[PDB]
Write a protein that binds this ligand. Structure first.
Ligand SMILES: Cc1cc(Br)c2c(CP(=O)(O)O)cc(=O)oc2c1
Ligand SMILES: [Zn+2]
Ligand SMILES: [Zn+2]
Length: 229
């Protein structure tokens, strides 16, 4: 049940969870879809990842207003590339509190991104330091190790069967690991497996560039990444 809304696509995944999809015509790579998440937690909405652009991200907020009609309490973005952080200014213009891995905020200017307002830090075992992620509700933020990028983070949704791998995870039939320009090829496989181990109950794996898949997305991604070493 995909819903076309302007140039974006929205798909309900669970009673309180929707996937947002936006597109950027990247010369040399076609019009690339990127997915994030929208989660209703009681009387507020939480967003995972921007769209590629400010205008698209404002359209996400317009869809939220029309389909949910509750305030967006915060957004968390999953690394410092345009598909995940390109719309930061639109969130700030809307008055939404924004969060990213401290490393993502440090990298943002050189990547052409605007930093989030708040920095997440992580324990040695990968779980977010809880004081840095206040009021995250059901969102469980995990740093699995370097993979697609050194700063990539992942998000589970407590109370659902959903976990979000962002650009770390590719679908179970993917032919490649995509853009490795900023990747850590030696650690990728272990990081993919650590994501799976952090969210063992998640049977629906959501990711940046394919429709939600089974956990075979994790095993297949890791198996491809074993070849990078
Ligand atoms: C060279 C290059 C750089 C990026 Br920054 C991308 C992205 C964004 P990402 O998915 O790596 O976060 C998507 C893509 O399709 O091709 C790219 C190629
Ligand atoms: Zn990326
Ligand atoms: Zn990506």
């Amino acid at each position: 049940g995909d819903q076309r809304f302007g140039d974006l696509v929205f798909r309900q995944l669970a009673p309180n969870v929707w996937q947002h999809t936006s597109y950027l015509d990247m010369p040399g790579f076609g019009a690339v879809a990127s997915n994030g998440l929208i989660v209703r937690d009681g009387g507020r909405v939480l967003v995972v990842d921007t769209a590629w652009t400010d205008d698209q991200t404002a359209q996400i907020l317009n869809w939220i207003k029309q389909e949910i009609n509750l305030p967006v309490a915060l957004a968390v973005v999953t690394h410092a590339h345009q598909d995940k952080m390109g719309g930061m200014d639109a969130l700030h213009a809307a008055g939404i509190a924004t969060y990213a891995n401290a490393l993502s905020n440090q990298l943002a200017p050189q990547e052409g991104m605007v930093a989030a307002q708040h920095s997440l830090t992580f324990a040695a075992n990968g779980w977010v330091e809880p004081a840095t992620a206040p009021n995250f509700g059901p969102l469980k933020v995990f740093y699995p190790g370097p993979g697609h990028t050194s700063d990539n983070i992942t998000v589970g949704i407590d109370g659902t069967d959903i976990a979000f791998g962002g650009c770390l995870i590719k679908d179970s039939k993917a032919k490649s690991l995509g853009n490795l320009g900023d990747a850590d090829t030696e650690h990728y496989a272990a990081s993919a497996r650590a994501f799976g181990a952090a969210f063992p109950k998640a049977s629906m794996i959501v990711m940046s560039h394919s429709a939600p898949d089974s956990r075979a997305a994790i095993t297949h991604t890791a198996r491809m990444a074993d070849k990078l070493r």
